[PDB]
Amino acid sequence: NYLYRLLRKSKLKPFERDISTEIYQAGNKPCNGVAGPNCYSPLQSYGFR
C-alpha cells in the first residue's frame, strides 16, 4: 500500500506534491499509454516485511 516515485523529468520544487500517474518515457519512441520497451511505471512498492 506504500509506494514511492523514483523517476521524473526534473527535480521537485519545495512543498510540491505530484499525484498524477503517467507512463514515464526516456527515449525517442513514445509510450502511447503502453508500458513496453523504454517505459516504466514511476510508482514502485516498498515491500515491507
Added chain:
Amino acid sequence: GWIFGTTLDSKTQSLLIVNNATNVVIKVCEFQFCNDPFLDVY
C-alpha cells in the same frame, strides 16, 4: 473569474478562482471546463 494550473478538464490538479457578487469558491481538485471556458448565466 480566473483559472490556474497546467491543463484543464482532468489529469492534473487545477486551481479555480471564480468571482461574482459573493462567492470565492476555490478548488484545487477538478472542474469541467471546455476549451472555451466561460461561466453560464442564463
